[model samples]
Target: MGTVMDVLKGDNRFSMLVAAIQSAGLTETLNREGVYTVFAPTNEAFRALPPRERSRLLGDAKELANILKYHIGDEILVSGGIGALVRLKSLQGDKLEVSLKNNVVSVNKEPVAEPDIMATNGVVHVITNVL
Candidate 1:
């Protein structure tokens, strides 16, 4: 119904992710009408992080910025576009490995719990792990 930012904000499953994105100063990036794909980690995913690691990441906005950017792709990529092995560059300047096997999509070896969430500007794929 709105931009990716709106979509993310509306989903209860993505509350933690929305917080992190805001904390990392990436809300505008997702709000912009640009073709992009987001591998958003669920709240459960964030909980999986070690207590110390979570504290460290949540402690500083600048420090968590790169990690959040690493979850984004500059182009619009739907589930159908992911083939056997597709390598895409992240906003963080690193590359991510997307794999599709038997109709299941995984990013960096973390399985996508939900896929192809359409937004005004892009798409969102919910992953179980914070990659």
Candidate 2:
């Protein structure tokens, strides 16, 4: 099975996220064996941020890692198991909201454009917004 980073690398939608992971020096972490659920923001989501804000995050490794951590859950969370609502504390210490509506998965109100991307150590759910 591919690791989380491997799966992400194979997807074009996560190019920006892959870059951020590398910039934040979190590539090794995400590539390692661990059960995680990642709410991955697409390149478009990052582009939606104010230019200065995006640049600021990219320039600051600590800040970038913290922000990225917020997108991760410490356990494997498949969309099928999540009912109407689910709340999990992110690696960054913020409580994340995951909800299911009409069979659509949403994280923090951001729709899951692509869900349940399998990885050896986790799953990736492509999202429309940055958390």
Candidate 3:
């Protein structure tokens, strides 16, 4: 496995997230050696937001960075069974909730359509929305 950047670059569903990471100037940090678990939102997820909200966030690099960081955790979270719940601290200095049910995993109640994408420094789970 390579860096998060390398993983995202190869995942078609996370293309928009890759672009946002670049825009937020977090590409290098995500590519670093520290362990991280990223819950990546898909393009459709972004599109689901109100246009103005999306535009405003994308326009502010700092806020965008914070929002992206909120989806990241410091450790690897592997959901092996239903009813698995994990509490994780985010880069934003807050805690996020993760749970698994019926073989589906979610973060902060947002469904992770694609989970556990491996990377050298961490992992990436593709989500359907921002939480």
Top model by lDDT, which number? 2
Over 4 Å off, model 1: none
Candidate 3 — what's its lDDT?
0.82
TM-score ranking of the models: 1, 2, 3
At residue 77, candidate 1 shows an lDDT of: 83
Candidates 2 and 3: which is better by lDDT? Answer: 2
For residue 94, what is the lDDT in candidate 3? 86
lDDT of each: 0.85, 0.87, 0.82
Clashing pairs in 1: none
Residue 113, candidate 3: Cα error in Å is 0.3
Instruction: For model 1, give the 10-residue run with minimal summed lDDT.
Output: 55-64
Residue ranges of candidate 2 with Cα displaced over 4 Å? none
Going through the candidates in the order shown, the clash numbers are 0, 0, 0
**lDDT value for candidate 1?**
0.85
Which pairs of residues have clashing backbones in candidate 3? none
Alpha-carbon RMSD to native, per candidate: 1.2, 1.3, 1.7
